[PDB]
Scaffold this motif. Structure first.
Motif, PDB file in Angstrom:
ATOM      1  N   UNK A 269       0.801  -1.103   0.132  1.00  0.00           N
ATOM      2  CA  UNK A 269      -0.088   0.030  -0.019  1.00  0.00           C
ATOM      3  C   UNK A 269       1.060   1.356  -0.009  1.00  0.00           C
ATOM      4  N   UNK A 270       0.469   2.340  -0.783  1.00  0.00           N
ATOM      5  CA  UNK A 270       1.109   3.551  -0.786  1.00  0.00           C
ATOM      6  C   UNK A 270       0.876   4.147   0.588  1.00  0.00           C
ATOM      7  N   UNK A 271      -0.161   4.016   1.128  1.00  0.00           N
ATOM      8  CA  UNK A 271      -0.380   4.589   2.323  1.00  0.00           C
ATOM      9  C   UNK A 271       0.167   3.690   3.371  1.00  0.00           C
ATOM     10  N   UNK A 272       1.254   4.326   4.135  1.00  0.00           N
ATOM     11  CA  UNK A 272       1.980   3.813   5.071  1.00  0.00           C
ATOM     12  C   UNK A 272       1.199   2.997   6.235  1.00  0.00           C
ATOM     13  N   UNK A 273       0.183   4.061   6.596  1.00  0.00           N
ATOM     14  CA  UNK A 273      -0.721   3.384   7.772  1.00  0.00           C
ATOM     15  C   UNK A 273      -1.478   2.382   7.617  1.00  0.00           C
ATOM     16  N   UNK A 274      -1.862   2.067   6.129  1.00  0.00           N
ATOM     17  CA  UNK A 274      -3.017   1.005   5.875  1.00  0.00           C
ATOM     18  C   UNK A 274      -2.221  -0.446   5.745  1.00  0.00           C
TER      19      UNK A 274
END
Ligand SMILES: Fc1cc(-c2cccc3ncc(-c4cnn(C5CCNCC5)c4)nc23)cc(F)c1CN1CCOCC1
Length: 293
Positions: A269-274
């Motif tokens: 995922x590009x979104x680190x938190x996901x």
């Protein structure tokens, strides 16, 4: 008297095991009786032992000495040289070698259930590493070792960093060795490394495993195909960044179960938190193993 202090004059070279990251690992027998009955050990040393390299290597040794887990290679001790104080790291010898070589050789007898056992073990080693606030940075099948048919261990810590007390990432200001085809987007763009970028790299390991290390399907080969084989040097990194930003990704390995492919893609995922946590990955993988078993 202290079995963690090894005298280098009793280490007999048997064979080279690998070379890379400004280091070498050798198979030696520690044979003080000089009758070839001593213990066989793995020995890591530096190719170029500058003061900067020696300082980094001693931190690596302290990192490994601090880790005690079934899926992390065992520290046995150290060698010190007189004068300039060169250092050698002594480890248990794991006779089946790297998981990369092992899978490349035995792909015919290694089924999905066995790949998931290895996957679970890798997740558990990494989760444990995370509890010490260490960031591995270099998770790849070439750095994972096979002890026997039922156990693998994370086998090298040469790029491993310790998080600052106040931050959840470590920024490398002047990188040397960079395995860019295993790197998270934020590691490529900002040189920022975290537990979440280790999870991204773990996704690439899972890809490696399910491709059975087929050379034409390696992460470097596939990413170079996607950005174009004409790209060279620093332009490879530029185009890789743009590719990942647009959700360009490694393909599903041929014959890979949906449930495993889904895990890979969630790690990327590009979104680190996901990105998933290693605790949750171990749970999920063990549930899949149970379902298959
Ligand atoms: F990441 C690595 C880890 C090791 C390593 C670290 C700690 C213990 C080890 N024990 C055994 C073997 C090993 C490797 N191959 N074989 C075969 C020998 C012939 N019989 C079949 C098995 C055994 N490798 C060991 C060696 C390497 F080389 C690399 C890779 N890099 C090397 C340079 O430093 C960075 C990591």
């Amino acid at each position: 008297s202290d079995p963690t202090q090894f005298e280098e004059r009793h280490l007999k070279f048997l064979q080279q095991l690998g070379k890379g990251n400004f280091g070498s690992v050798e198979m030696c027998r520690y044979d003080p009786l000089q009758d070839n009955t001593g213990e066989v050990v793995a020995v890591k040393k530096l190719q170029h032992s500058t003061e900067e390299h020696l300082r980094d290597f001693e931190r690596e040794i302290e990192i490994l000495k601090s880790l005690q887990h079934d899926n992390i290679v065992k520290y046995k001790g150290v060698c010190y040289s007189a004068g300039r104080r060169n250092l050698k790291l002594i480890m248990e010898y794991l006779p089946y070698g790297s998981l990369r070589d092992y899978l490349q050789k035995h792909k015919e007898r290694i089924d999905h259930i066995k790949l998931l056992q290895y996957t679970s073990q890798i997740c558990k080693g990494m989760e444990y590493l995370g509890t010490k606030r260490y960031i591995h940075r270099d998770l790849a099948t070439r750095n994972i070792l096979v002890e026997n048919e039922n156990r693998v261990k994370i086998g090298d810590f040469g790029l491993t960093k310790v998080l600052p007390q106040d931050k959840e990432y470590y920024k490398v200001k002047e990188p040397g060795e960079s395995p860019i085809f295993w790197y998270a987007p934020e590691s490529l763009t900002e040189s920022k490394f975290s537990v979440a970028s280790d999870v991204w790299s773990f996704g690439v390991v899972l890809y490696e495993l399910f491709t059975y290390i087929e050379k034409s399907k390696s992460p470097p080969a596939e990413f170079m195909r996607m950005i174009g084989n004409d790209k060279q040097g620093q332009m490879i990194v530029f185009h890789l960044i743009e590719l990942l930003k647009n959700n360009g990704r490694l393909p599903r390995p041929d014959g890979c179960p949906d449930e495993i492919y889904m895990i890979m893609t969630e790690c990327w995922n590009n979104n680190v938190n996901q990105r998933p946590s290693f605790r949750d990955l171990a749970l999920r993988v063990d549930q899949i193993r149970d379902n298959m078993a």
